[PDB]
Amino acid sequence: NALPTWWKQAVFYQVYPRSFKDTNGDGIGDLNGIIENLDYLKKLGIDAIWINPHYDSPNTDNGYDIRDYRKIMKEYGTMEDFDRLISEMKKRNMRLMIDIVINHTSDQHAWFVQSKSGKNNPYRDYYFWRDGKDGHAPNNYPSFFGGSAWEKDDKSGQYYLHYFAKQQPDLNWDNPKVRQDLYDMLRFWLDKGVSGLRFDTVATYSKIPNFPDLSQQQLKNFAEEYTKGPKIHDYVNEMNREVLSHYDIATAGQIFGVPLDKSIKFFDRRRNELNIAFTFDLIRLDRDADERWRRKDWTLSQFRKIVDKVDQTAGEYGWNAFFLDNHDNPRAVSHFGDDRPQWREHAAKALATLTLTQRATPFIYQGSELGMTNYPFKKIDDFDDVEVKGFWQDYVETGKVKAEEFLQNVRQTSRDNSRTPFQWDASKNAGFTSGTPWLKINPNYKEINSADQINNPNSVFNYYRKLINIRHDIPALTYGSYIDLDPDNNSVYAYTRTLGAEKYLVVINFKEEVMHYTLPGDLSINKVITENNSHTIVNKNDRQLRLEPWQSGIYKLNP
Ligand SMILES: OC[C@H]1O[C@@](CO)(O[C@H]2O[C@H](CO)[C@@H](O)[C@H](O)[C@H]2O)[C@@H](O)[C@@H]1O
Ligand SMILES: [Ca+2]
């Protein structure tokens, strides 16, 4: 029995404001650039937008190092602009989700400026300060962004903890005053009518008592160990009870590092924690858990097994999001498809069909609706991202990995592949900016741009538009149960979605050759709901499909 909600049936679109549309020529996108393109997202059929952080920030980590939670980022505009965004989405019946980054603040935040003053400052224990051991760090914790997770302060002689950049010191959630202050901050944004909150690295708020050294095995998988704090569900439930349950919102939790079997405690509706799971098992299936910048070969059978495990883990009482890329990962068509010119549009339409036929809330990352690709990074200085510089420092500058081997991996895995500016049209800089963009635009913008697709009925954009309309029209594509026809098949991905008598089949050929695919058991086709790249017609009661390379489709099955 499905408990339907607006957020289970929504299709979300993720805007990275820095790279969406610049309206004043400084080369950085801004809030007015979002406002000006709301009609575009409305034509796509999006009903909710999640924006990456929009707060005052020195931008060590592009908005994720927040200097003031109640001020708009200078580069993105003013509080008036923010209020106008809310008001214009409201006019269009679109709901806004903002990014909540409360594992850490900027080292420029008024709290940390006070805290670092001296052991006797009232704000001292808003952050984690510990003594060194034999004139080195308190323990062997590594940072996600390179080097040690402990930064020595000369004023006090103590180290402060930063799982991410040295400019992002971790907040001390063990102090109830910190949690209260964070709660007032949330009410500030919620009182403005925001409809959703995405919690950045939500599983790391609880730190391990006494900070023991990690073991050898643990250092190779430290992201999991940092999710092992003994109070994380107590804090998330407390936030639900004191804030989240008092408003009418959807909450998504980014549970990076949490083993899949432990994810349901954050999202089971009975636990009064969060609503929508962002899991990383799928999107990192081809990533090394230790040398986190490296990729490795993967197969469709691996990919489909993860889909099914993730689906089953949500079960009856949790709920998943589903996404294939985002601002932290390479573009879907390059990562999971074939981004060469012969195949790109077909593979993009095949991955859109996958996304929009999952038992999950789909998130569409900006530009994926056009089939944008990875960017051709050459040299190490072609990248912007703090994280890639941290990996370079840890692995290349130490002589552990050859520069060229590192680059062969990070060209494929870098976050910056998702962050090149949105390709609006075929004008100079793809119409993103009248100035010099902050990060160079992919030269494939003359082939891949929204102007060339919005009115072409055959485009990637219109195929997403069609799929979103189909999903809204067929309840089984949102709430139906999921069954993979053959989890070991590395050629043809085929699964059903079922609600009572109503059963649909999704079939995608991941091979660049014609595949014949015979349906199992007594299954036979009642109707074609949609196909891309097909050549052989499908008639009533067909029990076989002849799939062109990269062909994708949705069929309704006979009862
Ligand atoms: O590669 C990014 C790294 O950080 C995670 C959290 O583990 O991503 C979130 O947290 C970071 C620090 O606030 C942000 O830089 C990132 O953009 C945000 O999504 C994971 O995605 C990943 O391990
Ligand atoms: Ca701008």
Numbering used by the authors: 42 to 600
What did the authors write?
Similar to other GH13 family enzymes, the NX-5 molecule is composed of three domains: the N-domain (residues 42-145 and 216-520), the sub-domain (residues 146-215), and the C-domain (residues 521-600). Among them, residues Asp102, His145, Arg239, His368, Asp369, Glu428, and Arg456 are responsible for sucrose binding and residues Asp241 (the nucleophile) and Glu295 (the acid catalyst) are crucial for sucrose hydrolysis for PalI, MutB, and SmuA.
To investigate the mechanism of substrate binding and sucrose isomerization, we determined the crystal structure of the inactive E295Q mutant in complex with the substrate sucrose at 1.70 Å resolution. In the structure, the sucrose molecule was deeply bound in the active site with the glucosyl ring at subsite -1 and fructosyl moiety at subsite +1. The fructosyl moiety of sucrose binds to NX-5 through direct hydrogen bonds with Gln295, Asp369 and Glu428, hydrophobic interactions with Phe297, and hydrogen bonds between 1’-OH, 3’-OH, 4’-OH, 6’-OH and four water molecules. Therefore, the fructosyl moiety of sucrose has fewer interactions with the active site pocket, which should allow it to exit easily after sucrose hydrolysis and undergo tautomerization resulting in trehalulose production. Substrate binding also pushed the side chain of Arg325 towards Arg328. Glu428 is involved in a 2.39 Å hydrogen bond to the 6’-OH of the fructosyl moiety, which induces the O6’-C6’ bond to rotate 98.9°. The most prominent structural differences between NX-5 and MutB occur in the catalytic325RLDRD329 motif and its adjacent 10-residue loop (residues 330-339).
